[PDB]
Design a protein around this ligand. Structure first.
Ligand code: HEM
Ligand SMILES: Nc1ncc(C2CC2)[nH]1
Length: 289
């Protein structure tokens, strides 16, 4: 099964920078969302969930087809809460109806990371909407109540190795869990992209507690939390080494996250030899906007 990137007709870097800017401007404007966290973290989560359905074995799922717009995927229990991100992007799509859904969802994640002072994430256009019957079934996104072996095996389906997994999980520095969405509660409620996930893992005093949904999670007296799958990154000795590396090198984390996140968002897509090079968008701050 082959998905060939097809550039939206006649569009170039400047068109996509305009879409980026519209997303970024709305991120700045709609600041009250989720007790003043803003929409950044949920947009990152959305970009990950639309990509994380991919299966390397048959090239089903993935960001290309924009299938999150269809009920089956929209209503995946694993996607509870992401409707907020979709609603945020609706007026963007209305203004720029020419962008494909997969391009919009993935660009939303890139824009959020960058606007939250994260690394630059190169981004490529050309995802093409595919029909409702191409929507992957529910159950391809990961469970949070599992151990390191589960995480490692799960991510093999996405063609991610240990370093890539540990780098991607650093996104859990952003936002928070919500009991009604996932059965977990708490989080740093941060909207600035840093390597603090790793510092928190290594430096906090963690206690295994049950939350009000009767699920186990690790809590610190400082008020942070970790999912069992997060905590597994310090229980497994291979993951632990990488956690220590990223806790001790902000730049290395940024560079590795950028590569892994672009890869995640591009899995399943064949880029023609003459496709445009990846775009690196300027932030609003860099543009003086
Ligand atoms: C084993 C892998 C993973 C598991 C089990 C997992 C699980 C979860 C859960 C349960 C939540 C809370 C949802 C809610 O209650 O609203 C969450 C939130 C979040 N996840 Fe993950 N996740 C994983 C990997 C990732 C990856 C790879 C990324 C991105 C690179 C990511 C980005 C986020 C973000 C940004 C949030 C916060 C969303 C918000 O504040 O609304 N996650 N994750
Ligand atoms: N450390 C940590 N694990 C999960 C979270 C929240 C969902 C963002 N924070």
């Amino acid at each position: 099964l082959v998905h060939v990137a097809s550039v939206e007709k006649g569009r170039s870097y400047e068109d996509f920078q305009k879409v980026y800017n519209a997303i970024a401007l709305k991120l700045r404007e709609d600041d009250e969302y989720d007790n003043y966290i803003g929409y950044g973290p949920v947009l990152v989560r959305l970009a990950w969930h639309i990509s994380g359905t991919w299966d390397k074995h048959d090239n089903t799922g993935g960001s290309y087809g924009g299938t999150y717009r269809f009920k089956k995927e929209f209503n995946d229990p694993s996607n509870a809460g992401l409707q907020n991100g979709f609603k945020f992007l609706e007026p963007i799509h209305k203004e720029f109806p020419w962008i494909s859904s997969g391009d919009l969802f993935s660009l939303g994640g890139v824009t959020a990371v960058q606007e939250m002072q994260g690394p630059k994430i190169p981004w490529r256009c050309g995802r093409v909407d595919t029909p409702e019957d191409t929507t992957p079934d529910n159950g391809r996104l990961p469970d949070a109540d599992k151990d390191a072996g589960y995480v490692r095996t799960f991510f093999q389906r996405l063609n991610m190795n240990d370093r890539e997994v540990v780098a991607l999980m650093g996104a859990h520095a952003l936002g928070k869990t919500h009991l009604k969405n996932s059965g977990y509660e708490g989080g740093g409620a941060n909207n600035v992209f840093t390597n603090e996930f790793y510092l928190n893992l290594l430096n906090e005093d963690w206690k295994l507690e049950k939350n009000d949904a009767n699920n186990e999670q690790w809590d610190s007296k400082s008020g942070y939390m970790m999912l069992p799958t997060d905590y597994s990154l310090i229980q497994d000795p291979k993951y632990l080494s990488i956690v220590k590396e990223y806790a001790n090198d902000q730049d290395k984390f940024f560079k590795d996250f950028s590569k892994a996140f672009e890869k995640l968002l591009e899995n399943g897509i064949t880029f023609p030899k003459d496709a445009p090079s990846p775009f690196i968008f300027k932030t609003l701050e860099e543009q003086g906007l």
